[PDB]
Write a protein that binds this ligand. Structure first.
Ligand code: K36
Ligand code: K36
Lengths: 303, 299
């Protein structure tokens, strides 16, 4: 039960640095376009209440320094799409993988390639919380780092990093520049909603425990989805959607345990204790493994 | 505070598939040599009690099928170095990074690139345990997956995967083919020695907790190095050396908590327990971050 990231090599070949004035951050170079946070056009003075449309009309193509390593890529056009800048460059990235842009749902996991000055530094797995933040690891200069999943030969980009909230958690946009959650890219006071436990992932973890022979928590009872959802909210657990029930299908089939039967078992654990007992050796329930993460580590999918 | 692995791209470019007969595993292609576990030359029957020198002399270059994705590489020589087979191929790998082969010490961490059929599957961070096992995530066909660290531009390869023990932990060799630990590449149940907790790593992690505002376990007390080590050994923790105290220097400087002060806090947790509380979200004392790992992630 390791938190396993996707291999990062296909994304590494797409990272560049983008500088405007003295502000440097990371960009993503796909075909002949570089994507990066529009915050790069701000000075320290602009960050409090930036007027991005006004800041951008005073920039031209030759104000942007795009480098792949120490090699400059000439900028030939620029536009703003929500909170991302799109810089058209004169060279198509020969390392461009097959890719798509996707907007993920809370509870989904993805790998983050943390970068500084356009150089990859580390990779880790994390989950999108129900309050649209991620518990990441990001230092100054990390903006423009991306999150991604790999789906056979296709890289699905789902996150670009923009900010850190005063509570220490992180927020960003999809690759169309739309924020996850109710945040804005300005250095203002912002707070996230209360975090909840990701129920669908806890259920995936319970199925993984059963697959490995740890099944003391199974009981003789079942529940309805509506009854379960109403109880879950009382314990700060996310309600299940119909999509959550369907993505649990394969694990339910593999173990022969119906989804709603597993819900009844989880409902028992919430109302009574765990009695100091453990599941997969842990005293606490894990909620950052999705159903697909469980299948990955029990089957060994490659890319 | 996350377990962060090194970016794997430099190693992905070196991974190939090696097949001998009915056995397929992964190999590492550097310049014009492919390194892989010698177990690839065994049948199911052979694996029970292999005489590797005999099995190797009975093979020719054409019994080895090496595939780099779609392209077959032609084997033009072969030799055995301890538990690793070196296959000479007619083509140099243009994506060979700057690299070195190092043998690591218990307590040190590295990234694993788990591969199947020559294709990368996942990356995660591990520590070499004091009993010379690693707690990995490896399935059938993962042999020849490698462990590595990245220093500036240089890839240091430190581990090649060979086996899973009955307890579910893993064992392998360095890239010179020498096992870590008392294990042999034979299909028999092998036990490892008693494991201990890596004390210097726990302290580094407690410093990371303080950096991130988790402070409940601190106290005003201090201890001596010898008095701490007496308690540590009683609880199956590795003793702390003066070398370890030196290496914790930067975290001590950044937090203003002396190392021996932190030791007094860890001593209390060992004696009293954590009492249902958590540190950095964990209910257990984590020992697979080195001091360098913490420094890397925190500044
Ligand atoms: C971009 O590299 C940077 C990433 C931050 C720096 C520390 N760790 C991170 O994840 N982002 C910013 O500096 C960002 C700038 C735009 C939002 C305009 N601002 C930010 O994260 O401010 C933090 C903050 C703002 C207001 C109150 C409290 C904290
Ligand atoms: C190589 O791909 C494979 C990796 C194993 C398979 C399951 N998980 C892994 O990490 N290694 C072997 O199959 C290895 C071959 C020897 C000749 C080195 N044998 C092995 O790991 O045996 C496990 C075992 C446990 C208990 C009794 C007997 C064998």
């Amino acid at each position: 039960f390791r938190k396993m990231a996707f291999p990062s090599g296909k994304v590494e070949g797409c990272m560049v640095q983008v500088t405007c004035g003295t502000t440097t951050l990371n960009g993503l170079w796909l075909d002949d376009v570089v994507y990066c946070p529009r915050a790069v056009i701000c000075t320290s003075e602009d960050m409090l209440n930036p007027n991005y449309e006004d800041l951008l009309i005073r920039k031209s193509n030759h104000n942007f320094l795009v480098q792949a390593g120490n090699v400059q890529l000439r900028v030939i056009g620029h536009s703003m799409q929500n909170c991302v800048l799109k810089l058209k460059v004169d060279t198509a990235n020969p390392k461009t993988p097959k890719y798509k842009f996707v907007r993920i749902q809370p509870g989904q996991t993805f790998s983050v390639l943390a970068c500084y000055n356009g150089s990859p530094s580390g990779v880790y797995q994390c989950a999108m919380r129900p309050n649209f933040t991620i518990k990441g690891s990001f230092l100054n200069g990390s903006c423009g780092s991306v999150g991604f999943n790999i789906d056979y030969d296709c890289v699905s980009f789902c996150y670009m990093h923009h900010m850190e909230l005063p509570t220490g958690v992180h927020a960003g946009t999809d690759l169309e520049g739309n924020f996850y959650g109710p945040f804005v890219d300005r250095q203002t006071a912002q707070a996230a909603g209360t975090d909840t436990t990701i129920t669908v992932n806890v259920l995936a973890w319970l199925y993984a425990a059963v697959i490995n022979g740890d099944r003391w928590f199974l009981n003789r009872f079942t529940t309805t989805l509506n009854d379960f959802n109403l109880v879950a909210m009382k314990y700060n657990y996310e309600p299940l959607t119909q999509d959550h029930v369907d993505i649990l299908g394969p694990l339910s089939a593999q173990t022969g345990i119906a989804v709603l039967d597993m819900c009844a078992s989880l409902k028992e654990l919430l109302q009574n204790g765990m009695n100091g007992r453990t599941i997969l050796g842990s005293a606490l329930l894990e909620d950052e493994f999705t159903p697909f993460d469980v299948v990955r580590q029990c089957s060994g999918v490659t890319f």
